[PDB]
Design a protein around this ligand. Structure first.
Ligand SMILES: Oc1c(Br)cc(Oc2ccccc2)cc1Br
Ligand SMILES: Oc1c(Br)cc(Oc2ccccc2)cc1Br
Lengths: 114, 114, 115, 115
């Protein structure tokens, strides 16, 4: 039900081998590790979770943008990019979290479909 | 070699049934019609052209954002969104032109891969 | 009543010395040149027009993004960024057209206020 | 030396009365509260800090986008928009953190200048 896609606005390409960590907010308000991976050659990260595991809750998707830029020899502004949202059962079932990266900027959108 | 994808930042969804017109710049500097279609349920428009037809040149992709918003009962700022670029044979072969739409704003990126 | 602001997303700075050409759609559907200038050290372009001159119409603000990236010796994707909109059709408004630039991407937004 | 500016992409206006909380990473890796305020009628938040107070560190600027969309009675996707960055590590700089907001999307950029 959850896919993360990362794009590079400098080279006009997927952002490949970018580390992505997903956390679920626990009852004590701390962020607990949920799922993680690295984006593929298409800039996409599939198979993070299952419908069964992805219960309603607040999730954080952290994208390691700083390591991405450093590997390209480019000095970036952000330590990482966060995307924090509520999964809701009465909305559509599938969530794509997309991020478009520049050294000093990023944009993020959610594409939520049934 | 060319795909157009349109997303709606208000509803967090593909932008469906959006008209898209592609033009190639002619030798006299006018824009000649090249290809067109409407985005599908996925917000994507495939099959606009073929490798054979898509020679190097300056192309314009016009996205009918105004009709999109009006159909949703929302008053938009832009008459349309243009994306104007050079197709180059010595870059990667496949071009995705993506646009993310808001009533008073849009962003566009190119994802160019081999 | 019309201001254009351009930012550089690679450098995290104003985009300085960016050429901007404004056109207005004429009675015969052609784009007539309306005003032009370059962004300053703040990435802003002021003084393009006056409240008297800036009548109702369809305007195109062409931002010469290719010349900017290339004048910096970078090879960008877009020829330019065009922002096309109806203005002043419920009476005079003030418009800021903002653009944030990357070699293969740009974002634009409008801030519209009523004086 | 720190300014936060927030714009509304749905209305084409400044995003007014947006709550912003700034944190600084402490020696024990926790986020310590640093400064907070709300955007004005121009969508700008000035006066958060001083050049003396704003030392080297890792800062998080949390923009309370959910409260903004909901205080307007809209149901948005994000809880907030967080912008996390190292500041002043080559000496004092001025930072503008800009955010452009839509119910299911936001963009952020930094403008960093050397006084
Ligand atoms: O498949 C996609 C998606 Br979804 C978004 C996209 O563009 C953006 C991603 C993040 C923020 C803004 C635009 C490009 C492609 Br190709
Ligand atoms: O003064 C500004 C700034 Br700074 C950014 C701006 O546009 C953007 C803000 C955040 C993310 C992308 C673009 C518009 C205006 Br008027």
């Amino acid at each position: 039900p959850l896919m993360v896609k990362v794009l590079d606005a400098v080279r006009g390409s997927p952002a490949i081998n970018v580390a992505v960590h997903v956390f679920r907010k626990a009852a004590d308000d701390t962020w607990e590790p949920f799922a993680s991976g690295k984006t593929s050659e298409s800039g996409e990260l599939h198979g993070l979770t299952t419908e069964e595991e992805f219960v309603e809750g607040i999730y954080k998707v952290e994208i390691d943008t700083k390591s991405y830029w450093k590997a390209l020899g480019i000095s970036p502004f952000h330590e990482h990019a966060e995307v924090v949202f509520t999964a809701n059962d009465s909305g559509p079932r599938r969530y794509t979290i997309a991020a478009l990266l520049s050294p000093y900027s990023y944009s993020t959108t959610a594409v939520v479909t049934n």
